[PDB]
Amino acid sequence: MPFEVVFDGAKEFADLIATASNLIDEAAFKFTEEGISMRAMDPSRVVLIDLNLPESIFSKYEVEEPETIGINMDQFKKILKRGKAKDTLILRKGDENFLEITFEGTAKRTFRLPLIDVEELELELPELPFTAKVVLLGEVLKEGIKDASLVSDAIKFIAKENEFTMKAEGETNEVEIRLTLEDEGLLDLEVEEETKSAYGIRYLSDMVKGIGKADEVILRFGNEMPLQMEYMIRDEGRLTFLLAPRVEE
C-alpha cells in the first residue's frame, strides 16, 4: 500500500489524467512492482481506455507491495489546475487512507486527500485480427478532425495498399484528405486490404485535443472492426484508446 513517486515536471501526466477524467470519472490505478496500470471502461460500454507506465518514467520510484488504489477524477482535476511546468510532483501514500501530493520550489506545497476505493470489474480484451495498421502524426490528424468536426460527426477512414483517405460526408458539406507515403502527415503504413469505416468524433476530438501536436499515433483497424489508437509516453509507457464504429451508412 505505501509508495513514493517523485518526478520533476509531470505536465504530460497531468493532461493525460485530465483527458482520462473527461472520458470517465470512476478509475482505479493498480500499482505493481513494474509500475502503474489503469483500464477504464465506458458507462455506455462503447469505449475503453488503457494505460501502462513502467518504473522507467519518473525519477524516484519506491513501492512496498503491489495493490489497487482509487482516486476520484473530480478531486484530481481539482488538483492538476495548480501544476507548474517546473514543479516537483511527489506522490506519497502510507497505510492509512491519506494521499499526499507535494511540490518543492519557491514555496513547499503539500496537499492531503482521502483515498476511496474503486471496484470496477477488469477483463482482458480478446484478440481480434486487425488487418489494417498505420502510424501517423498527431498534429495532422488533430487539425483534420477539428476541420471536419463542425460539418458532421461521422468521419470515414479508408485504407488501401499505400493509400489513405480521410473523408467527411453529409448533405451540404464534403471534406476529403489524401495521404500517401510522400505526404507530410503519414509516417508509415501497414495496410493489408481495402478497409473503410466511419467513426464518431466527439470522444475522438476530445482525446486528440488533449494530446499534443508533436506526439505520434498508431491506428489499428479493419473493414468494420473497432479501431484502436495507441501511442507511447517517453518511449517507455503505453496508452491506447479503443472504440467501435457505427453500422449506419
Partner 1 sequence: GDMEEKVARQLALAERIRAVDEHHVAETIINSHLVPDLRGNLRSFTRQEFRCVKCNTKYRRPPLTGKCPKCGGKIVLTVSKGAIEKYLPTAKMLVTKYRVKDYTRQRICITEKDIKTLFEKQRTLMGFSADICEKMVKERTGHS
Partner 2 sequence: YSTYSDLVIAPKEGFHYRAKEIPDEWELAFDVKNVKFEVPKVKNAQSKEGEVIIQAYSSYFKSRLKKMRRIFRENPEIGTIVDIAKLSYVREDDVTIIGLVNEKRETRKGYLFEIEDATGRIKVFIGSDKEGANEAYSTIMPDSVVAFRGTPGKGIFFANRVFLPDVPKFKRSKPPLEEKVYAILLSDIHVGSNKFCEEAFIKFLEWLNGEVNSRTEEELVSRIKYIIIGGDVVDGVGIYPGQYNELAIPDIFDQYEALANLLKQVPDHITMFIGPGNHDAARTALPQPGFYEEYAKPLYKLKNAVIISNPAVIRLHGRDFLVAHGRGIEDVVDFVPNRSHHRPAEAMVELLKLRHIAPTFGNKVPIAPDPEDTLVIESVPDLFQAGHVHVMQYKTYNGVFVINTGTWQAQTEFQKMVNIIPTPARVPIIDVETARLRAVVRFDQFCEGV
Using CB under 8 A, list all residues that contact partner 1: 45-46, 126, 128, 200, 226, 244-248
Among partner 1, DNA, partner 2, none, the one that 68 touches (CB under a kind-dependent 5 to 8 A) is none
Q: Compute the distance between CA of residue 175 and CA of residue 144 in angstroms, rounded to an integer.
A: 9
Give yes or no for a contact between 57 and 35, defined as CB atoms under 8 angstroms apart: yes
Q: Report 65-124 residues binding its own copies (CB under 8 A).
A: 75, 78, 82, 106-114
Work out what residue 121 binds among partner 1, DNA, its own copies, none; the CB cut-off runs from 5 to 8 Å by kind. none
Closer to DNA by CB, 54 or 210: give it.
210
Q: Do 75 and 112 form a contact (C-beta atoms < 8 A)?
A: no
Please identify, using beta-carbon distances, which residue of 68 and 75 lies nearer to its own copies.
75
Is residue 78 left, alpha or beta, with left meaning phi > 0 and alpha meaning psi from -120 to 50? alpha
Interactions with its own copies, residue window 147-166 (CB under 8 A) = 147, 150-151
Neighbours of 172 (CB within 10 A): 6
Minimum gap (Å) between residue 114 Cβ and its own copies? 5
Contact letters for its own copies, residues 130-149 (x by CB under 8 A): ----------x--xx--x--
Distance CA 236, CA 244 (A): 27
Q: Which residues are at the interface with its own copies (CB under 8 A)?
A: 75, 78, 82, 106-114, 140, 143-144, 147, 150-151, 172-178, 183-185
